mmCIF file of C-alpha atoms in Angstrom:
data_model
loop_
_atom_site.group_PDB
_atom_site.id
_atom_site.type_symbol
_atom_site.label_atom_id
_atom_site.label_comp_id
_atom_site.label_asym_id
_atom_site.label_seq_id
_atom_site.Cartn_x
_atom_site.Cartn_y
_atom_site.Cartn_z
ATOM 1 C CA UNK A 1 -0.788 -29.555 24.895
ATOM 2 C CA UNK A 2 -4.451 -29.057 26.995
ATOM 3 C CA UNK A 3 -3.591 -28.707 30.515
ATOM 4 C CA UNK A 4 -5.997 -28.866 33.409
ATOM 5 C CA UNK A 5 -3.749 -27.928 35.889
ATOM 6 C CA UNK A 6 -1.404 -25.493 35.649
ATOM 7 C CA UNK A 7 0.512 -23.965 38.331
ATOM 8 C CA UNK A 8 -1.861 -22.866 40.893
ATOM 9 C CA UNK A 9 -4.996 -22.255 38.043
ATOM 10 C CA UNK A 10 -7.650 -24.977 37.285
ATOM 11 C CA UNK A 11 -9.785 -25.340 34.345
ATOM 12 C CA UNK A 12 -13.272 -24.289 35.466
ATOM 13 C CA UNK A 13 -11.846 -21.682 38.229
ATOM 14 C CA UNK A 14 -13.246 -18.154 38.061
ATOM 15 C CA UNK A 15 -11.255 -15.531 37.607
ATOM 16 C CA UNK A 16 -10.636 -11.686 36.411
ATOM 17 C CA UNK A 17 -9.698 -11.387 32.477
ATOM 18 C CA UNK A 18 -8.239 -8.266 30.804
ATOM 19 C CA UNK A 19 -10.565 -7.374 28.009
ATOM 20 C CA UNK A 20 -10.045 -5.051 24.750
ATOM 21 C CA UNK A 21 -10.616 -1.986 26.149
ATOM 22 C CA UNK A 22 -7.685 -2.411 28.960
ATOM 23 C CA UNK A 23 -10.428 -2.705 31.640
ATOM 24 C CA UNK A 24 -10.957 -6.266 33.904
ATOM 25 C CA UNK A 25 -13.772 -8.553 33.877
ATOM 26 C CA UNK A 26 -15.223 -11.801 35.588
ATOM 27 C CA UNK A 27 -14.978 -14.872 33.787
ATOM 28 C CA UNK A 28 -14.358 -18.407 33.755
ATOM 29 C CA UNK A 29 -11.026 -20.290 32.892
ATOM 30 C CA UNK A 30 -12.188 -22.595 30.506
ATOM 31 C CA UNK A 31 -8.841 -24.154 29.099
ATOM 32 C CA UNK A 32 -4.931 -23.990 29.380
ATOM 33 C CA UNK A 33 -3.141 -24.154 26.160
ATOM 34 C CA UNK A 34 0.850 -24.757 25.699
ATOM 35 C CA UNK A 35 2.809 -24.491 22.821
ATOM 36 C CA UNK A 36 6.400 -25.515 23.692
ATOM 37 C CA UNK A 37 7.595 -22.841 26.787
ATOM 38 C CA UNK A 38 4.764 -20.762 25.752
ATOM 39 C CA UNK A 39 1.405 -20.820 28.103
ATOM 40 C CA UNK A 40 -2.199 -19.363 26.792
ATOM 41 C CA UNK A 41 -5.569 -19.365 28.780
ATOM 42 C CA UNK A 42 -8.915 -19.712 27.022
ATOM 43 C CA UNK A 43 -11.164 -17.059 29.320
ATOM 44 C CA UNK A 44 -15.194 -17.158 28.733
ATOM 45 C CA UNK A 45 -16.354 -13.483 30.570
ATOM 46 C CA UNK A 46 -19.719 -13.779 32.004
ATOM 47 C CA UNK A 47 -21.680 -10.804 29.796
ATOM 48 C CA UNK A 48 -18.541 -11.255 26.997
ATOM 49 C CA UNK A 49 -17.271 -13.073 24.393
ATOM 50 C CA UNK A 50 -14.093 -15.445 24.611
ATOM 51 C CA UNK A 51 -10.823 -14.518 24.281
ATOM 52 C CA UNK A 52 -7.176 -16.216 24.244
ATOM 53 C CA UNK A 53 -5.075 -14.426 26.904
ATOM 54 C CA UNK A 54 -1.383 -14.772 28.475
ATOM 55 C CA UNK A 55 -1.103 -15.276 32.085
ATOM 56 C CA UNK A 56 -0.283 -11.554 32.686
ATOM 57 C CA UNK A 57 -3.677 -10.969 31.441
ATOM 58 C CA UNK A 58 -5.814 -12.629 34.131
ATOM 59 C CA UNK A 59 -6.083 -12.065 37.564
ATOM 60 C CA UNK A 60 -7.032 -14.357 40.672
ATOM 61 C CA UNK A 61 -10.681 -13.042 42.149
ATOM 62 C CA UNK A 62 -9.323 -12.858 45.612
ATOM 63 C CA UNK A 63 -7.391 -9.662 47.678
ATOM 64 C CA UNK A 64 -4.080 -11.299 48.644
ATOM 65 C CA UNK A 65 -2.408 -11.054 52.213
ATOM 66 C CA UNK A 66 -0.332 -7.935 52.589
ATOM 67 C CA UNK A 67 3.066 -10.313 52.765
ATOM 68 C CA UNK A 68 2.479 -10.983 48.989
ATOM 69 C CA UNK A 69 2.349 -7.431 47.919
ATOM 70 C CA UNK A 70 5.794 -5.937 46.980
ATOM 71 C CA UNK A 71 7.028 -2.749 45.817
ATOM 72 C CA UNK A 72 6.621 -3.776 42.085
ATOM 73 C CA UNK A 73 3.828 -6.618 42.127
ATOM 74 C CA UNK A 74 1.768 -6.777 38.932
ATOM 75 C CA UNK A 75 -1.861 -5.843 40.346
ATOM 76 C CA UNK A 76 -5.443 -5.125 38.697
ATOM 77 C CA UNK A 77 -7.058 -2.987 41.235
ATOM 78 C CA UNK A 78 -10.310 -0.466 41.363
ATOM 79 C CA UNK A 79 -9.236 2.452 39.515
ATOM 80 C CA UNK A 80 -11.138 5.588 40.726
ATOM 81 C CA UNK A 81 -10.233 9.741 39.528
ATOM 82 C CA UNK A 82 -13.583 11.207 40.112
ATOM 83 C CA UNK A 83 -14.902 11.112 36.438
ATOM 84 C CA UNK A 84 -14.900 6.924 36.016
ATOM 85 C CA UNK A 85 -14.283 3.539 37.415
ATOM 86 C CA UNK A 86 -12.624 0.443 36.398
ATOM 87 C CA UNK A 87 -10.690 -2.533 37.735
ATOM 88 C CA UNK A 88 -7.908 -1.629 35.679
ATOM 89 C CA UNK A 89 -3.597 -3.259 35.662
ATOM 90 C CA UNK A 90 -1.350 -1.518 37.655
ATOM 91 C CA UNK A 91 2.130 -1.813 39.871
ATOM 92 C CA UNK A 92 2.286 -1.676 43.668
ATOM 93 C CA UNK A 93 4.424 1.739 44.232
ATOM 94 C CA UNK A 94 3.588 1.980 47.770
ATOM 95 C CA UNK A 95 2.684 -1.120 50.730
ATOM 96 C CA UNK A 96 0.670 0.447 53.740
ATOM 97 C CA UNK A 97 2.875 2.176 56.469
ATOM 98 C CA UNK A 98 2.479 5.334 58.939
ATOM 99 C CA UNK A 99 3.115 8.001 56.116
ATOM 100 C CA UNK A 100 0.607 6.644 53.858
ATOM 101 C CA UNK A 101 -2.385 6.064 56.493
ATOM 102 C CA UNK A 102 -1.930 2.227 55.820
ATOM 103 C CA UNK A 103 -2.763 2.597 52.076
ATOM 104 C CA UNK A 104 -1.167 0.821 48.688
ATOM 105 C CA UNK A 105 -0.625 3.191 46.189
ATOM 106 C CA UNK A 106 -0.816 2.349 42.327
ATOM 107 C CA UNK A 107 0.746 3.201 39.436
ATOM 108 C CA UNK A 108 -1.876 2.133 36.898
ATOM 109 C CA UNK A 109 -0.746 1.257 33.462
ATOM 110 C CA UNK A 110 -2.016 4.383 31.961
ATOM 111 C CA UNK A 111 0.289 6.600 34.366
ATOM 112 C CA UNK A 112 -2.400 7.844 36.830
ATOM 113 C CA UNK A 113 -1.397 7.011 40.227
ATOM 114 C CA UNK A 114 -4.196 6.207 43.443
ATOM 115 C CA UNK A 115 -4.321 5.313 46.948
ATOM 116 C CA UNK A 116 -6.545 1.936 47.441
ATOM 117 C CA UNK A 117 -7.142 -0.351 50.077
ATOM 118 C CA UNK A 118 -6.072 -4.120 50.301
ATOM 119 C CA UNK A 119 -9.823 -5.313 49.496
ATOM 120 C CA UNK A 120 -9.602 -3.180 46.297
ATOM 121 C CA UNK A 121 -6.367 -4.888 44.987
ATOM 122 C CA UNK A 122 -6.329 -8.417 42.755
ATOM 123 C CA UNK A 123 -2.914 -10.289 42.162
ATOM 124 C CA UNK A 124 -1.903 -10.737 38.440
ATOM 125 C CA UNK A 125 -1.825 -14.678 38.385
ATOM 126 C CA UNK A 126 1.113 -15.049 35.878
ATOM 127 C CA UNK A 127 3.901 -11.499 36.049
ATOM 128 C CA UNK A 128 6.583 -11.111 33.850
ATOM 129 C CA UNK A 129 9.971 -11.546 35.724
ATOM 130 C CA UNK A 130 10.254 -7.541 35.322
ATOM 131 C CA UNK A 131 6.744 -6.479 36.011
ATOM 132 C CA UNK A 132 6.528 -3.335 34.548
ATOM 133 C CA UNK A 133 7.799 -4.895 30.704
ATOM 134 C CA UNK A 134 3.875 -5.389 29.728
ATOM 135 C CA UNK A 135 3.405 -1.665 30.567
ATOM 136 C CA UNK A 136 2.573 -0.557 26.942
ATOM 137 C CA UNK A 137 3.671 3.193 26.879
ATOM 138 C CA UNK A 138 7.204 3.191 27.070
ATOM 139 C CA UNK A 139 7.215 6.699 28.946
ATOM 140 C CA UNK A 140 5.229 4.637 31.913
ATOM 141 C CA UNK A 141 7.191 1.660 31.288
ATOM 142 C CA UNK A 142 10.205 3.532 32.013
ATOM 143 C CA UNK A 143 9.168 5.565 34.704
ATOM 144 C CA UNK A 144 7.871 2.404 36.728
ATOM 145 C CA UNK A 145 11.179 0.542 36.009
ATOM 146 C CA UNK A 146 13.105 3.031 37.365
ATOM 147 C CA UNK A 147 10.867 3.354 40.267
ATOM 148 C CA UNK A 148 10.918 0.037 41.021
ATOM 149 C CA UNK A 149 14.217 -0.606 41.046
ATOM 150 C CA UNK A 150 15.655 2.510 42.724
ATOM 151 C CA UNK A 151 12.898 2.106 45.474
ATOM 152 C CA UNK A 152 13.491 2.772 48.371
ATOM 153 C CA UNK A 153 15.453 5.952 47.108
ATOM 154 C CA UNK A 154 12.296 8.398 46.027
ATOM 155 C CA UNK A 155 13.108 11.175 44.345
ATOM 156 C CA UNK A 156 10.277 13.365 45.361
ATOM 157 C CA UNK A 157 9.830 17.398 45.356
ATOM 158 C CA UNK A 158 8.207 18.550 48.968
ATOM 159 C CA UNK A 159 4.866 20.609 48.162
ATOM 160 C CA UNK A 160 2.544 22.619 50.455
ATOM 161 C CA UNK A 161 -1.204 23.931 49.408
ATOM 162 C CA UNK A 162 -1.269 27.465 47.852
ATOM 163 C CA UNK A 163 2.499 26.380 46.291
ATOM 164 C CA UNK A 164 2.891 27.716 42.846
ATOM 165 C CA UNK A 165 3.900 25.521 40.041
ATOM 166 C CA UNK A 166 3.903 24.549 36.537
ATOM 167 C CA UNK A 167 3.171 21.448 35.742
ATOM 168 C CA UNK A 168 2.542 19.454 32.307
ATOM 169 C CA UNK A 169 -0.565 18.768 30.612
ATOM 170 C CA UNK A 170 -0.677 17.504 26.568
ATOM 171 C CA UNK A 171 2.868 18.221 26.483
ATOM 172 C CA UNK A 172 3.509 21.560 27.714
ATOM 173 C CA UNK A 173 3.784 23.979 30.935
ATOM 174 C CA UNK A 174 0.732 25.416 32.873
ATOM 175 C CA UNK A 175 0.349 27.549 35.677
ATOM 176 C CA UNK A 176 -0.836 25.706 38.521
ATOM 177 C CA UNK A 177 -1.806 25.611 42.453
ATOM 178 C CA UNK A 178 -1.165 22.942 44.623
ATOM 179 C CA UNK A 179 -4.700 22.335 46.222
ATOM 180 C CA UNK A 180 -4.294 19.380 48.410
ATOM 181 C CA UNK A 181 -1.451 17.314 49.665
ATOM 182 C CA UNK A 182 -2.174 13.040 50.407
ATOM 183 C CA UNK A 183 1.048 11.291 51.395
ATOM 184 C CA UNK A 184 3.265 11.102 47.866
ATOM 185 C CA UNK A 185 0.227 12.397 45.889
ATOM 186 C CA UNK A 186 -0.251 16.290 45.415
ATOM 187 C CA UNK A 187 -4.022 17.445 43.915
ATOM 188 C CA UNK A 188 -3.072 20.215 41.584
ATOM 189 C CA UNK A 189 -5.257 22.664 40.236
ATOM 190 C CA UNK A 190 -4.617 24.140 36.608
ATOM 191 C CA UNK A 191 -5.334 27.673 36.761
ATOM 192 C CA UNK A 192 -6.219 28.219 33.615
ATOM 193 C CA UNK A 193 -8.468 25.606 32.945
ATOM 194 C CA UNK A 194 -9.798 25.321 36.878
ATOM 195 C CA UNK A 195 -9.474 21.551 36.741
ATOM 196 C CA UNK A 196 -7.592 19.439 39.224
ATOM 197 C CA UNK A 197 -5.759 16.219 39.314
ATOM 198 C CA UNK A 198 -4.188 13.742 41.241
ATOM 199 C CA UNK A 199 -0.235 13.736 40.465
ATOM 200 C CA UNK A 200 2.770 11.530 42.494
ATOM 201 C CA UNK A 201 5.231 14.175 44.162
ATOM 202 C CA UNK A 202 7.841 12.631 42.252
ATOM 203 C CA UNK A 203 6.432 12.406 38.478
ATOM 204 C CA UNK A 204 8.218 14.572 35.744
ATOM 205 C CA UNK A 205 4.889 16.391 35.482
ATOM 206 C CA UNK A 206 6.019 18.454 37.906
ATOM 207 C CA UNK A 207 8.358 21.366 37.083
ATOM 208 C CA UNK A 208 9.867 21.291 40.146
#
């Protein structure tokens, strides 16, 4: 059937749409189809095409309160690692508290991991009952599930600047510095290559 109405969405509402290339976009919700328990939305971008998306592919336009942000809540939000920038799908990992100077972290769907701020966070309008199962790469997938669920239990190793390391880059072991420390993120510097990135403290990347 054509809906109008469905849930909380409206035909005609404006809204964020995931588009090809994994990265979100402004459009318009131009129609709600149903066939039997399964829901589609028609989604016209505003410098795009259309396209026929599931509810875990559009977002609302709007930065929720904090109250509806869990550990595990299906979130596009401003991704940002010094070399691009996208509003790109992620999972909450972190809500803000002392240790984090009041900051969410992310777990983006591509496994990099950021500090944002609530107006930089959008709320996927329609999760899957296990947020993390529309996380593509099954290494990610995994990793965020077991987050998730084991959260508040962190397995995390404790790192101090000038600490020597290896950690993993295209699938094998470099030497490596941390540089910088940020609440659960460590900045590490690849010695080799003299490159850094942003890593969790608890990510497999890490030999430790």
């Amino acid at each position: 059937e054509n809906l109008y109405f469905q849930g909380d969405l409206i035909v005609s509402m404006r809204i964020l749409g995931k588009k090809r290339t994994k990265t979100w976009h402004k459009g318009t919700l131009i129609a709600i189809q149903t066939v039997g328990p399964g829901k589609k939305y028609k989604v016209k971008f505003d410098n795009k095409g259309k396209s026929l998306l599931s509810g875990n592919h559009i977002a609302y336009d709007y930065h929720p309160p904090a109250d509806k942000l869990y550990v595990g809540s299906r979130v596009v939000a401003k991704y940002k690692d010094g070399n691009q920038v996208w509003l790109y799908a992620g999972i909450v990992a972190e809500t803000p508290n002392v240790k984090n100077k009041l900051r969410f972290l992310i777990f983006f769907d591509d496994g990099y991991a950021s500090y944002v701020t609530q107006s930089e966070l959008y709320p996927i309008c329609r999760p899957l009952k296990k947020t993390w199962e529309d996380i593509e790469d099954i290494s990610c997938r995994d990793f965020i599930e077991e987050y998730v669920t084991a959260y508040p239990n962190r397995p995390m190793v404790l790192l101090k600047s000038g600490q020597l390391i290896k950690t993993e880059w295209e699938g094998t072991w470099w030497k490596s510095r941390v540089e910088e420390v940020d609440g659960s993120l460590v900045r590490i510097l690849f010695l080799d290559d003299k490159r850094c990135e942003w890593i969790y403290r608890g990510s497999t990347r890490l030999e430790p």
